[PDB]
Amino acid sequence: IPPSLPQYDNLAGKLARRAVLTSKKLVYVWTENFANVKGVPMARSVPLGELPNVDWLLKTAGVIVELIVNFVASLPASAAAQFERIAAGLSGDLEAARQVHEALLEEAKNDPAAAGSLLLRFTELQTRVIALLTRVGLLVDDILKSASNLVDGLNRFRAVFGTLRLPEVADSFRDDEAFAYWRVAGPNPLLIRRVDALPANFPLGEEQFRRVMGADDSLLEAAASRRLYLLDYAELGKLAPSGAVDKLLTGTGFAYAPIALFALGKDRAGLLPVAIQCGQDPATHPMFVRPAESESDLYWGWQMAKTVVQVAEENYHEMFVHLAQTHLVSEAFCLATQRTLAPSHPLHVLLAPHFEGTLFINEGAARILLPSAGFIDVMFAAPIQDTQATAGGNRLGFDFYRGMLPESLKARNVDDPAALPDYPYRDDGLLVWNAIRQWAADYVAVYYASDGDVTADVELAAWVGEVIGSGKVAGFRPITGRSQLVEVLTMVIFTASAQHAAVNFPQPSMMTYAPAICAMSAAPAPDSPSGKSEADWLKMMPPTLVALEKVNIYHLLGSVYHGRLGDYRQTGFPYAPVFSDRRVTASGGPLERFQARLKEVEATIRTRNQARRKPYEYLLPSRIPASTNI
Ligand SMILES: CCCCCC/C=C\CCCCCCCCCC(=O)OC[C@H](COP(=O)(O)OCCN)OC(=O)CCC/C=C\CCCCCCCC
Ligand SMILES: [Fe+2]
């Protein structure tokens, strides 16, 4: 049976669906008082049908067990003794669970007709792997309680990896061009903007600019030729505390809201860092200017200033770009969808796959990552109550329309490949955005023939109402026609899939090594550009506990690829197609066209990567999950 809009469904359909929605609303319940994320709309609890499937669980547990084994193996034999039996037991039990899963799958295959008799056993396996994860929880608590015993000046930052290979950034982090390239190809491709005139509170002058870029360049010429780009972290607010923040677990930490200027040379061959101010007030933050190789008295001040930017970057990236603007946005769309679009509504069928695992992973962020003494309280400088409030405020202020990729690119004046040629997030992102848009256009056209079909759809009206109201999605507005609906669906889908991928999957290769990036520093911003030493810079590096949590959490969160954009098949048993409607699934139809377009996009991106200075692979469709689930 094809899905239907409520105004067209037959009566038995209409009453069945309104009763289903009355039921859904008892199961999927809004709160703004979820523990550790006050003010953000959340599910009160995760319904049974929203727990992760076995396939996700085995993937996630697999990575976690690899990390446990790696940790235990890095310990001295004496310390390892406390944990070896437990670690061996987790490995063996996970393997046992894989085998149960594989047996169940082969049993279903031997008699597909009898496969419904297996569903309790499939949920029993889900329960079992979740219980395995509870045991992991207990082991993590124990490791952390014994952190003192277990846990060029940087050897401790290598040691925490065990036998995991250090990422490339461990080699290249001090390099100026590499630093600049984070701005366009790193986990946070969103903050960088063109600058036409400098902020008043960033008094970089003509003479300083020419010192760096050459006597034949100028601020005026560079600005006018679209060669100046600014990173300004003012929006971090309380994520950049004024001073020292003393915590029990990590001692004294600092973070920052700096401003940094980058420029292209006249040949536009690449972005170069020009100047950094380590906070918003120039009266208390001197100007650091890019030093020449011979200026050994400026060298370490400049390394310190870049580390200041990178501290700000982890705070901005993780709390805003990643948690607030992917995870916590998709939370709202998940809840509105289940509460207001009947399961037989075609938009429910389309969107549900894009929220698989979202409620679960988000409850995990709040319960595990955000309480006092949790990962974020360890890894991020600000008091945890300030972090929670600031991330939440950022989610609440995120404008849905202004946040769409093309609008973002335009508002920041970074949408012109002629002016800023090397911007992989922009160029690959647009390919994926546009492919999704055509799919959304095609799919909408199946079910909505007129703008009348959009305005007369009472479920869609209720959905918009809940997204605006209970969901507190800023900038969302009434949907009055088909083209608008398409732009909306494109954004909801892109957000859930590609955007999350682009800002989540860089975590292992770019964020696991604390000297290259960390959301806390152990020292104030450099007080002068001149006369700093390696020892002054080393003082900024975090306590080892920070590094230990960092390598493990960022490896995990970027190593689970579950589901794939466009596949539209269940990702757990029985792995059936999402769509039944032959208008969607037919040969040469909307779905096949979307699938084929994504492979075209993949081929284009691979071609682009052969010619890039470094490959950018996060927006390869083959590496984009349909949902935000890790
Ligand atoms: C950091 C900023 C991220 C921002 C984005 C956050 C958004 C979404 C991500 C939310 C992710 C939520 C957390 C991951 C969820 C994993 C799937 C899951 O649900 O696992 C649940 C278990 C059990 O939970 P429970 O509450 O009973 O006990 C917590 C400890 N009191 O949690 C973990 O395995 C702990 C984290 C494993 C950390 C790495 C294992 C390290 C083992 C090796 C040695 C470790 C030494 C430390
Ligand atoms: Fe994520």
Cα–Cα dist 444/428, whole Å: 24
CA of 557 relative to ligand 1 center, distance in Å: 9
Distances (CA, A) of 10 to 14, 22, 80, 532: 6, 19, 66, 76
- Distance of alpha carbon 458 from alpha carbon 496, whole angstroms: 24
The SS3 of residue 607 is helix
550, 511 contact by CB (below 8 A): yes
DSSP assignment, residue 62?
Answer: H
Query: Annotation-wise, does 348 bind a ligand?
Result: no
Angle CA(481)–CA(485)–CA(487) in degrees, nearest 5?
125
Pairing status of strand 193-194 against strand 228-232:
antiparallel
Nearest alpha carbon to residue 164 among 92, 67, 229: 67
Asked if 322 contacts 187 with a C-beta cutoff of 8 angstroms, the reply is yes
CA distance 511 to 595: 32
* CA 198 to chain centroid: 30
Resolution (A): 1.8
- Residue appearing with tokens 């600019």: 209
SS3 81: helix
User: How are the residues of the chain apportioned to helix, strand and coil, as percentages rounded to the nearest 5?
Assistant: 55, 5, 35
Instruction: Please name which of 317, 347, 312, 352 lies closest in space to residue 335, comparing C-alpha atoms.
Output: 352
Residues in CB range of 68: below 8 A, 6 or more apart: 83, 87, 90, 136, 139
Which residue has tokens 């952190």?
147
SS3 590: helix
Amino acid at residue number 61:
A
Asked if 255 contacts 223 with a C-beta cutoff of 8 angstroms, the reply is no
Which residues form the pocket of ligand 1, taking CB atoms under 6 Å from any ligand atom?
60, 64, 67-68, 71, 133-134, 136-137, 140-141, 143, 318, 322-323, 327, 361, 364-365, 367-369, 375-376, 379, 548-549, 552-553, 556-557
Nearest alpha-carbon partner for 5 in 465, 344, 485, 350: 344
d(CA 219, CA 209): 7
In single-letter form, the type of residue at position 180 comes to A
In this structure, what DSSP letter does residue 48 have?
G
Q: 613 is written with which tokens?
A: 């200075």
Q: Which two tokens stand for residue 397?
A: 């202020």
Is the peptide bond prior to 577 cis by the omega test (within 30 degrees of 0)? no
| Terminal alpha carbon distance of the chain | 33
Q: How far is the CA of 369 from the centre of ligand 1 (A)?
A: 7
3-class DSSP state of 155: helix
Confirm whether residue 555 is marked as ligand binding. no
Report residue 224 as tokens. Answer: 């006018």
Which structure tokens are listed for 546? 């920070």
Q: Which residues contact 284 (CB under 8 A, 6 or more apart)?
A: none
d(CA 507, CA 559): 9
Under DSSP, is residue 32 helix (H, G, I), strand (E, B) or coil? coil
Which contiguous run of DSSP H or E holds residue 253?
strand 251-253
Compute CA 509 distance to the chain's CA centroid, rounded to the nearest angstrom: 14
190 and 321 Cβ atoms separated by less than 8 Å: yes
Report d(CA 420, CA 433) in Å as an integer: 20
The DSSP bridge partners found for residue 265 are none
CB 405 within 8 A of CB 433: yes
Alpha-carbon distance of 2 to 275, in angstroms, equals 59
Q: What is the DSSP string of 420-456?
A: S---HHHHHHHHHHHHHHHHHHHHHHHH-SSHHHHHT
